[PDB]
Structure 1
Amino acid sequence: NPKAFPLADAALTQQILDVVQQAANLRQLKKGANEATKTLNRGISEFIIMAADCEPIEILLHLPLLCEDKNVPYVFVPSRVALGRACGVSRPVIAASITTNDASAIKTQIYAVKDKIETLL
């Protein structure tokens, strides 16, 4: 019913933020709504993490539309302050994208969170 949906719980959010941080160190993370949008167009995204406290929320609502057309899982986290900190940058982040790489060192972790997001949807 709310525009930002599904919203991950406290337990799920930490695991998402964990994977985001590891992907950042491995250069497997695309930060920002614009960069996330490009990944969806290129079909190189594992899943999209969005911040549900974006002010206004509408400036990232095109991503769910692109995700559902492309069958890419997506999930909302409560805070953009927390998402930006996990992303590794010094500024809040409203959207981020995990880049597809079957030869990554964090493959198992990504698919674990990817499955739970799919269950959430």
Structure 2
Amino acid sequence: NPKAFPLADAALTQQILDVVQQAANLRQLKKGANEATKTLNRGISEFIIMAADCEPIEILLHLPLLCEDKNVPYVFVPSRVALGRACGVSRPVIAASITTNDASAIKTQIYAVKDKIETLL
């Protein structure tokens, strides 16, 4: 029913941000909506993280239309403010995307969260 849907629980958000925070260290993370919009059309994104408390939430509801048209998993999470802290940038982030690389050191972690994400959807 809510526009921000599906929204990850306290637990599933946990492994997501862990992937996000490390992925920033590995230069595998594109941060913010326009980069999220960027990656979807180029089809280099594993899955997209969105903040459910975004002001206004509709500023990012375009991304799921792009995401599921390209059959890319996506999800919502409660607090934007936490995501930036994971993302490593000194400002809130409302949207983030993990870029495609089968040579990344974290292919198992990303795929692990990806599988859970698909079940959630």
Provide TM-score, normalisation by structure 2.
0.99
Superposition deviation, residue 53 in structure 1: 0.2
Superposition deviation, residue 52 in structure 1: 0.1
Write out per-residue CA displacement over residues 23-70 of structure 1, whole angstroms, 9 at most, x where no aligned residue: 000000000100110100100000000000001000000100000100
1:118 matched to which residue of 2? 118
1:42 matched to which residue of 2? 42
Write out per-residue CA displacement over residues 63-111 of structure 1, whole angstroms, 9 at most, x where no aligned residue: 0000010000000000000011100000000000000100000110000
State the aligned residue count. Answer: 121
RMSD over equivalenced CA pairs, Å: 0.4
Runs of 5+ unmatched residues, structure 1: none
User: Match of 1:30, SS?
Assistant: strand
Deviating runs (4+, > 2 A) in structure 1?
Answer: none
User: Match of 2:93, SS?
Assistant: coil
C-alpha distance in 1, partners of 2:81/2:39? 23
Runs of 5+ unmatched residues, structure 2: none
